[PDB]
Amino acid sequence: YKLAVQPQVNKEIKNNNDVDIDKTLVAKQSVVKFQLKTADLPAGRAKTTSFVLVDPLPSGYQFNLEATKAASPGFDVSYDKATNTVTFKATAATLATFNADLTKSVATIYPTVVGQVLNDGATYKNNFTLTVNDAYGIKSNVVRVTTPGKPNDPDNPNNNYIKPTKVNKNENGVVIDGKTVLAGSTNYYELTWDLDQYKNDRSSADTIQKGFYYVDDYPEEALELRQDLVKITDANGNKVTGVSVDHYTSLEAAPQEVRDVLSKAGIRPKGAFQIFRADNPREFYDTYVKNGIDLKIVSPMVVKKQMGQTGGSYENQAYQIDFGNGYASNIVINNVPKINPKKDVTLTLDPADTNNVDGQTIPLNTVFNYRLIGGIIPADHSEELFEYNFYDDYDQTGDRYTGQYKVFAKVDITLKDGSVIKSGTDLTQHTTAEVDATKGALTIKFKEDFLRSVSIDSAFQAESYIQMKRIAAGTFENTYVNTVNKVAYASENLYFQ
Ligand SMILES: [Ca+2]
Ligand SMILES: [Ca+2]
């Protein structure tokens, strides 16, 4: 009875619900099992003294020793860390079994490797080598599976990168990334939920139950959310149903569920964030994920007033979390301009006049002007200009309004039709004035049609001279406020003292 057994060998690869996944697509951190099966040992074999299955596991597959042993009864399991290689030896019991009756066939048992796939866009190939009686052995077939995240994949023609994307826009739908945005304007952010690569996924139940989320780490120091304008649409153009919207002031403030999901995925937001959520993972998965249908989230956010006084930049970033795996969007930067309106006293109406600083004391009965310098509105800005007003509340004890004002361009203003209004040009014709002589105050209002004719790509600044007569001795306060696009901005003296 010489001639040791020479069974055929079949390696099999399965997900955590014991479904075959050979040559498919499975999500990152999926549990992936390998079964090292052998054919039945034939009647008239020799005594099997040793039956060892060596399996050098693929790069990026993380071996779970305890689970493996749990799944591989009748086998001693040993693992070399250096080489990521598991070895199974049939125990004395299993060999007693193979040898009990050499005159009749016997079924083998098999060891199962339990582990997870750690990396995105990767192909994981596996085989194993039986050797019998510390002599002859044989290498198995090759099985494999792929994680989504990689283009030109032969097994999954839809596989591309997982890239959630973010873009900023004005209400016309024009791209406003990188541009100046005036306090009160809204950022009509469009977040993409990138699912197309997940098409024909074959992950287990346990993996899908880890859920689907989307985070917008908005800058709460600069923006407040218009939550009521959010519009989740699929890539076929349809409304999206199962996703709920929440916002939270900080990570510490938000439920145990969300802290966990963000913590697991490795996402720690800066202060406040907006978070979307698949209400039923399974349904979401079955409708959009498995079908490779990108989502679109429109999440508009308005710029706080309090930011026009400081100015400075803000940035928005998004994250998608599929099966508990975290991916970052591109970062979109905008900046708010400091609107810095200035007030001076001058004896002339000449916009090019000498820039004297001298403590301007106005002799009794002198005709003078308050020079009300408007805020600088920088080139390449969000929305159209539609309001630009100079309010001026004067003290009637000391100052009498003459009924005469003029307005001047203070920088080169470019209109839409391409014509350019040079700095210094009289713009008075494009204004009117609200006067209340009784209260002691007036507002010079640029005309809406004229402002809306200013290119959004042009800088804009004007100044008003309002003519007064000083009618008493003593010194006299004067208040001026410049209002742009419905946002008030206090003036300071042009010369600090
Ligand atoms: Ca993609
Ligand atoms: Ca934030």
From Swiss-Prot:
Q: What does the record list as coiled-coil region(s)?
A: none
Q: Where does it localize?
A: Secreted, Cell wall
Q: Which domain of life is it from?
A: Bacteria
Indicate the family of this protein. Belongs to the antigen I/II family.
What is the name of this protein? Probable cell-surface antigen I/II
Q: Which residues of the full protein are shown?
A: 751 to 1241 of 1310
